[PDB]
Design an enzyme around this catalytic site. Structure first.
Site, PDB file in Angstrom:
ATOM      1  N   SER A 277       1.061  -1.087   0.158  1.00 40.54           N
ATOM      2  CA  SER A 277       0.057  -0.144  -0.394  1.00 40.54           C
ATOM      3  C   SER A 277       0.380   1.558  -0.314  1.00 40.54           C
ATOM      4  CB  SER A 277      -1.070  -0.137   1.210  1.00 40.54           C
ATOM      5  OG  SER A 277      -2.078  -0.761   1.052  1.00 40.54           O
TER       6      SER A 277
ATOM      7  N   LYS B  63      -7.511   4.122   5.110  1.00 39.04           N
ATOM      8  CA  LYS B  63      -6.215   5.157   5.152  1.00 39.04           C
ATOM      9  C   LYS B  63      -6.602   6.141   5.240  1.00 39.04           C
ATOM     10  CE  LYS B  63      -3.889   1.926   2.872  1.00 39.04           C
ATOM     11  NZ  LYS B  63      -4.225   0.928   3.116  1.00 39.04           N
TER      12      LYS B  63
END
Ligand SMILES: *[B]([O])([O])[C]([C][C]([C])[C])[N]C(=O)[C]([C]C1=[C][C]=[C][C]=[C]1)[N]C(=O)C1=[C]N=[C][C]=N1
Ligand SMILES: *[B]([O])([O])[C]([C][C]([C])[C])[N]C(=O)[C]([C]C1=[C][C]=[C][C]=[C]1)[N]C(=O)C1=[C]N=[C][C]=N1
Lengths: 98, 426, 182, 49, 49
Positions: free
Chosen positions: C45, C88
């Site tokens: 990520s 996120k």
């Protein structure tokens, strides 16, 4: 080089999608002549054989049908005889004598 | 003596006793069975609570036992010498029968014996599907119960008559019932989540073909990127370095690395380092079917050769630069065609596959129709030279050749490392 | 770091190797660490974040700390989609709000994740008010341009400064070699 | 490039937070037509699914 | 048990429909008899449009 359609066309052409086919039943283990010969040898010689094949292939049904096709002398009527109140043995007698 | 119940062995006397290898090596009765065979020791079992037990005298065995099982079911039982001495006759069923009109007629007769109702077209379609299961144009799958299951599906989809249309309907329904994973993959590719290019020319990017596990194997393209940088010879397999690549994958990487080392010799060791990664992989890679794709991508990266992204490349390669046959070629080709169709057929997308797999190309109806219409191509090669010639759209030999460009790229990388050494010494 | 994390690290390492070629092998060594990590890392990520951090370290580029960077990258320098983008973005907004919104904090996320951006009411209100930004990129070039606040191509560009930094590192290594030989 | 709020506003606008909705019950396996078709085939053919 | 009734094999008329997660079946798909007994796969999409 690029493959043409005819070089890639693998399907067998269809004469007609009608007129239900009438075909005789194939012999057991058709296309499996190796296994058929092995099992014939096992039946003739009275050996113990083992059928090996990829799973879900019809080995059990084909083998059962073929063994039904086979024939043998009438098996003797086996039974248990008490040699004593402690001892028993398996006694085999001709059919009907039981 | 009146309370002993006959077992299978007792009623098998004079005839045959059919047993399964799984039911022996799983239930732990194999040792007792082989002792009853060798020593005639058939003992009617009793619960341990029994206060007493009849002394059953050993009985000579007249039956002929015939074990049935898969090769894996017996390789776990062949290690016992008692098995090899008791069972001498090995009856092996071929996984595939030859594709012959006699075999098709026998299959039709077998289906008619089951109680089905075959039309000529329905039998033809079932026989073609059996050939497809074996993945061979000249062999038909011998698993008769698989064909029987497909026949039952087609019969209930056709009202009881196995029409060619009914069999096609059954095949399509079976494909669609397990299409959820591929449908989600197609949606992800369309949304841009998994960026794939079925058009245009990109340097060092090749649409490798990957076959997933689970219920019927669906092929799907996997983008492959190779990047060439100056440095001492190190062809890095990012999927193997990370631990995702399997043993055979590493073997393929090393094989093509050796081919690259030995093919370009006009410098010392290979003056480039090549990084190979399956983008959006995130899963362990097993097998050698992307060797050709890896090799052509690495060659393009070395020579700065834009590769036609519309063509998916599959096939293993040996370290002399020759394409080797691969498995599940139908799944790979159909998956790439599915992805191309989802993005819209451009009229030039195709698949580069080994010449040795032509006997395995049993494509579906839609793929064949696309090939006939010219909307989809199928290239067959035997050496990686031809595959890169197709992808880059040029010829290796000849001036402004692909080989000349790759040589120039290697020369440039070597001269850059050389200039770095010049600066180091001065 | 897990298998996929190592794959991301190797991918961006290969991108860096092949992107800058005007020397031999990459004349720098880059150390990448998650500070206060203390826990096993799994997933890809932060490939974009790692790549932009490495590029800034190479070129001495001060990166805007108000922007959080997520998104995977392939070794051709293109940002790839990532999962749980809502979590996120909302977590970074939570941390920014806890420290007090500066009116310029934002998140740099892959362009491919726009279909996945289902943010909460508060984050959307902050974006509407201009107190929080959401940048979308598809190549790491854009992400570095946003973070460093400059334009990659052009005179006095980010690319020129990264090239100058690599040249300085190679210069120092060959100066060490010059001393060794003389 | 910075995403505008409208480009980020994903919530479906509300006509009114009142007037309790009256909707007919949906068919079983709604939105799961693949599973519905498979199970219909299993019921018709008497298979095991 | 000191004894047990000898129950004769009985033909099965029911249609069994297994339910489970993909993980609950991938540990059961490895048995070929499962794939031969259960031919119809009814997959539920995790997300509807
Ligand atoms: B292949 O077909 O050799 C390919 C090679 C890889 C380097 C692209 N691998 C696979 O297709 C395998 C399955 C397989 C089938 C037949 C023979 C050998 C291997 N699967 C995968 O690599 C895979 C990867 N990600 C997800 C699922 N499966
Ligand atoms: B990611 O979203 O790919 C990320 C990569 C990492 C380098 C920042 N992984 C994670 O955040 C994972 C969870 C995860 C969610 C979805 C897909 C993949 C992974 N967790 C962690 O790395 C982590 C680390 N420390 C504490 C807790 N979780």
């Amino acid at each position: 080089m690029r493959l043409s359609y005819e070089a890639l066309e693998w399907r067998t052409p269809i004469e007609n999608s009608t007129e239900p086919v009438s075909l005789p039943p194939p012999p057991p283990f058709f296309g499996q002549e190796r296994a058929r010969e092995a099992l014939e040898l096992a039946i003739r010689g009275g050996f113990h054989a083992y059928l090996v094949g990829p799973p879900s292939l019809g080995k059990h049904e084909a083998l059962l049908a073929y063994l039904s096709t086979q024939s043998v002398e009438t098996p003797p009527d086996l039974l248990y005889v008490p040699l004593s109140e402690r001892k028993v043995a398996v006694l085999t007698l001709p059919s009907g004598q039981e | 003596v009146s309370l002993i119940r006959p077992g299978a062995v007792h009623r098998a006397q004079g005839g045959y006793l059919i047993l399964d290898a799984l039911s022996l090596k799983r239930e732990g009765t194999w040792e007792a069975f082989k002792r009853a065979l060798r020593n005639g020791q058939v003992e009617p079992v009793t619960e341990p609570q029994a206060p007493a037990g009849l002394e059953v005298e050993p009985f000579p065995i007249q039956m002929q036992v015939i074990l049935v099982g898969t090769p894996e079911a017996f390789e776990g039982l062949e290690e016992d010498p008692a098995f090899s001495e008791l069972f001498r006759i090995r009856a092996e069923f071929s996984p595939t029968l030859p594709a012959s009109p006699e075999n098709c007629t026998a299959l039709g007769g077998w289906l008619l014996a089951q109680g089905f109702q075959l039309t000529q077209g329905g039998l033809t379609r079932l026989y073609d599907e059996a050939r497809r299961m074996a993945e061979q144009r000249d062999r038909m799958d011998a698993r008769l119960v698989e064909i029987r299951a497909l026949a039952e599906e087609a019969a209930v989809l056709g009202g009881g008559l196995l029409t060619a249309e009914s069999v096609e309907q059954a095949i399509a329904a079976r494909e669609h019932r397990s299409f959820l994973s591929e449908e989600e993959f197609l949606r992800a590719v369309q949304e841009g989540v998994i960026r794939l290019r079925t058009t245009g020319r990109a340097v060092g990017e090749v649409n490798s073909l990957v076959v997933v596990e689970a219920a019927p194997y669906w092929g799907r393209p996997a983008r492959l990127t190779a990047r060439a940088a100056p440095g001492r010879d190190h062809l890095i397999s990012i999927d193997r370095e990370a631990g995702l690549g399997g043993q055979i994958f590493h073997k393929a990487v090393l094989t093509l690395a050796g081919y690259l080392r030995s093919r370009y010799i006009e410098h010392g060791s290979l003056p480039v380092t090549i990084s190979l990664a399956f983008e959006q992989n995130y899963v362990s890679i097993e097998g050698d079917s992307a060797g050709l794709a890896e090799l052509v991508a690495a060659l393009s990266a070395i020579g700065n050769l834009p590769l036609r992204q519309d063509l998916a490349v599959t096939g293993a390669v040996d370290q002399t630069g020759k394409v080797l046959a691969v498995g599940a070629i139908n799944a790979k080709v159909e998956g790439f065609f599915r992805v191309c169709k989802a993005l819209g057929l451009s009229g030039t997308q195709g698949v580069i596959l080994p010449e040795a797999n032509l006997a395995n190309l049993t494509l579906r109806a839609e793929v064949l129709e696309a090939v006939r219409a010219g909307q989809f191509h199928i290239y067959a090669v035997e050496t990686a030279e031809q595959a890169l010639e197709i992808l880059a759209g040029a010829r290796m030999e000849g001036f402004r050749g692909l080989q000349e460009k790759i040589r120039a790229g290697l020369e440039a990388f070597a001269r850059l490392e050389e200039g770095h050494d010049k600066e180091d010494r001065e």
